[PDB]
Amino acid sequence: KPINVAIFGSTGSIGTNALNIIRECNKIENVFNVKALYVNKSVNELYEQAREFLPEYLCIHDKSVYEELKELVKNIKDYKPIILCGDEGMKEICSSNSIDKIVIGIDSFQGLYSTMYAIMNNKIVALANKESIVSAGFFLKKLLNIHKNAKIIPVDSEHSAIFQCLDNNKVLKTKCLQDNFSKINNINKIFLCSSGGPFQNLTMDELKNVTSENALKMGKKITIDSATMMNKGLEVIETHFLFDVDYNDIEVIVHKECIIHSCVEFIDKSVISQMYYPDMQIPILYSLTWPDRIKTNLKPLDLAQVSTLTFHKPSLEHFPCIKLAYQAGIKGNFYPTVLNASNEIANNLFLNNKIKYFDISSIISQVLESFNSQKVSENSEDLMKQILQIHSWAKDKATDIYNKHN
Amino acid sequence: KPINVAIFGSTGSIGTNALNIIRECNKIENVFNVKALYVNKSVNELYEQAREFLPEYLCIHDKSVYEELKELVKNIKDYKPIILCGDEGMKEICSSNSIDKIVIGIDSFQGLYSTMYAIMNNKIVALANKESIVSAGFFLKKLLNIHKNAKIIPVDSEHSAIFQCLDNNKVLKTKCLQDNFSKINNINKIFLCSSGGPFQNLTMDELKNVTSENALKMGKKITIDSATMMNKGLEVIETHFLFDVDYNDIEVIVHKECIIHSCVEFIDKSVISQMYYPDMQIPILYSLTWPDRIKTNLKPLDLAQVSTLTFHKPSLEHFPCIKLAYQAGIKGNFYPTVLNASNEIANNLFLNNKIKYFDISSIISQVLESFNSQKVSENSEDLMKQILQIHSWAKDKATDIYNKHN
Ligand SMILES: NC(=O)C1=CN([C@@H]2O[C@H](COP(=O)(O)OP(=O)(O)OC[C@H]3O[C@@H](n4cnc5c(N)ncnc54)[C@H](OP(=O)(O)O)[C@@H]3O)[C@@H](O)[C@H]2O)C=CC1
Ligand SMILES: NC(=O)C1=CN([C@@H]2O[C@H](COP(=O)(O)OP(=O)(O)OC[C@H]3O[C@@H](n4cnc5c(N)ncnc54)[C@H](OP(=O)(O)O)[C@@H]3O)[C@@H](O)[C@H]2O)C=CC1
Ligand SMILES: O=C(CC[C@@H](c1ccccc1)P(=O)(O)O)N(O)CCCCc1ccccc1
Ligand SMILES: O=C(CC[C@@H](c1ccccc1)P(=O)(O)O)N(O)CCCCc1ccccc1
Ligand SMILES: [Ca+2]
Ligand SMILES: [Ca+2]
Ligand SMILES: [Ca+2]
Ligand SMILES: [Mn+2]
Ligand SMILES: [Mn+2]
């Protein structure tokens, strides 16, 4: 049985790493059928991928470049795809009975929409977009309880590492984002590793004046998130939701070599970790082969050559985004939504030289303080409406706080 | 529901660590039932253990301290144990329907005899004794093919580590020492971690001069073997047999902080590792709970405090015992039997200040070169007698070489 996969956001970083490892793995033996590709706007790139991979379905979000895609594709001999457009095309792909697994490599809040529909169709969802879990974790949980045969399999590297450390006999008794996942897998505690980002050695005074150029010189948004360690704060909430680990049992550790990707402490106090070169091919591949593994031709890890690994605790004073993520997660309710939203705005303000480093945490903290816990709707549709309303409110609030001071 | 366990070698390092962790696990709930304790002659220590754990059976190998044991144990009120001695006693305990799991913490080739009988009675054998696997790997594989419900669960720290790094969903479909274990578990290669012992950074001139005093100041035997890295050599052969990993796929790494206990590379090139403070309580406990894990109160690993982990290749010029073990393993047949036996002798000679460090590998090498391959008996009982004959031959040959140069 080949593995029938759709790639959503095929032309981006995650998407192109997915097709890479699929390509290489297929050269060893033909295991993967790429059944569908979906992008926003990159019509020429999508064309090139369709030419190589010959998928049954092509979809582009933006209506404006639909006709252009149809024209380009006719150049391809012996190939009659179903060529689609927009949300409707995304839903048609998700409901195909010939597709088993969907890689969600669509960034930002937009990525939740396809994630939702992939679950609704009881697919395996290889989810890279941590913001969907941070903004909508409780909703995704409820949804995964309606759609019992759907599964989220984590792609974010640290989360993939945690998942790889587990015994699948116990994993198969539950699934990601389920209450009691950690209890069933006998997990006590998580070490969430971090690169620490480019500002890891700067003083408070140096940080006061750092700029986005300093942080940038991956995509801009996750790069800024890595500089402030808000990425890791988002990943702490992601860990809580994915594995049902309490916040007091998630420890961020700075591992600048980026060889140990994260570690899992069980109840006996034994720790199991996943290691490799920094790499998104293995996380992606595992999400598509779980619960099995297949041969690759990747470079073997040469531990003697690596020689030295280092670990240290991040300073919360230098990286206050971490503290804010814990605070929001511990509060629960819609605070993680608010955190994610306000960080989207502040990240962009910093990227564009409108605010300073410590203003990022300042704005986020102020939005969080202004929010009030809301009765969580038991209706799935109403709940999604609440998440959207709170998201838009928090972004607006972030922007207001910025413009007040400015 | 209690797990019924026998501790063979109850008064030694492994045996005392086993009872220490069982004690802690039995504080509130009756998790384990200590059914039997077996020792060589340490009759007063056994007495004290009998008072604590009140096993159904006590057994002493040395019949000359039997009456002293019967004397000591009558002081314990409303306790009527079955007190047995020697090989007969051992076999009656292994035969009991009241015993599920046996921890083998008997040292040297002597530990093979209870290992074999434990397998012949379809028990779970929690095996610390590596010499039995090196000396009789092929024989134990054959025995485990006959005795279908018997299992060897490793307790040696690195081998427990490897075993934990595997996915139990795959492990559960095979068992250690079974052909095709590595295929079923998708294992590509093993990183077999070592402390490197006390002599790891000596120059060749310095190493010429080392004495047993230097190496000593666990059993004394294993302690000298750690110094010469013959322990690791034996462990390579143990790896090969337990996990069906080819010798070219076992890599010794020196990791002096002893936090990472060993690592498995899978066929996708993902590596999984097991880490903890140097410790034998986790390996022993896991051998008795596998495929589950239970709660301990061990000190949690503080990776930030450890701060630094290092890795390098051992020098084979400095640690020639490693090379000899690989050579012996790869030759197969009874060469591992001869390696282990000649080492028993050479280890003891160095321990007692009779030979120099490089004479250890010299003696072992000469015995290996002297040995001629033998047709492997096809029946169990003859194959065992052949192992014993060769083992005795190689010890005598070692002593003869020593006597001649001396
Ligand atoms: N990059 C990495 O290594 C890691 C990323 N992640 C997460 O992965 C997610 C994806 O990130 P990354 O690859 O970096 O992002 P990119 O910006 O590189 O790629 C996003 C992709 O989504 C497509 N897309 C955007 N909007 C739509 C839409 N409405 N419909 C369909 N396709 C759409 C884009 O199409 P187009 O080409 O037309 O613009 C593009 O192919 C993020 O949430 C990130 O946090 C997680 C861990 C590490
Ligand atoms: N110590 C450790 O941490 C490690 C040990 N191992 C392996 O575990 C095994 C045991 O090692 P260790 O505990 O250090 O050894 P010890 O020397 O500390 O203990 C030996 C135990 O075996 C008993 N014994 C010896 N001969 C017999 C016999 N004929 N019948 C019954 N009991 C007998 C001894 O009894 P008595 O007290 O009566 O002499 C004692 O209880 C070895 O094969 C070693 O390589 C593996 C990894 C690490
Ligand atoms: O979250 C992420 C990115 C952010 C984290 C990071 C950054 C660099 C390395 C490891 C971790 P952070 O700890 O700084 O927050 N992943 O999960 C990325 C992993 C590998 C990215 C990769 C890039 C280039 C080449 C191959 C791999
Ligand atoms: O084979 C062994 C002993 C020899 C190996 C060793 C020695 C020290 C630590 C790690 C490894 P070696 O690599 O030098 O051959 N184990 O598996 C021991 C494991 C740890 C147990 C423990 C022992 C002493 C004190 C507290 C803990
Ligand atoms: Ca006597
Ligand atoms: Ca495992
Ligand atoms: Ca091989
Ligand atoms: Mn990540
Ligand atoms: Mn060992």
SSE class of chain A: alpha/beta
Main β-sheet, spatial strand arrangement of chain A: 4-3-2-1-5-6-7
Compounds present?
Answer: NADPH dihydro-nicotinamide-adenine-dinucleotide phosphate, ligand A1L41, calcium ion, manganese (II) ion
Spatial separation of the terminal alpha carbons of chain A = 60 Å
Multimeric organization: homodimer
Measured on Cα atoms, how large is the radius of gyration of chain A? 21 Å
PDB class: isomerase
Keywords: Inhibitor, Malaria, isomerase
Assembly: dimeric
Entry title: PfDXR - Mn2+ - NADPH - MAMK218 quaternary complex
Structure description:
The structure is a homodimer of 406-residue chains. The first copy, chain A, has three domains: 155 residues, 3-Layer(aba) Sandwich (Rossmann fold); 159 residues, no CATH class; 91 residues, RNA polymerase sigma factor, region 2, helix turn helix motif (Rna Polymerase Sigma Factor, Chain: A, Orthogonal Bundle), CATH 1.10.1740. In chain A, strand 1, helix 1 and strand 2 form a beta-alpha-beta unit. Chain A has a seven-stranded parallel sheet, sandwiched between helices. Chain A is an alpha/beta fold. The relative contact order of chain A is 0.11. At the A-B interface, helix 8, strand 8, strand 10, strand 11 and helix 14 of A face helix 8, strand 8, strand 10, strand 11 and helix 14 of B. The structure holds NADPH dihydro-nicotinamide-adenine-dinucleotide phosphate (NDP) (2 copies), the ligand O=C(CC[C@@H](c1ccccc1)P(=O)(O)O)N(O)CCCCc1ccccc1 (2 copies), calcium ion (3 copies) and manganese (II) ion (2 copies). One calcium ion (CA) binds next to helix 3 of chain B.
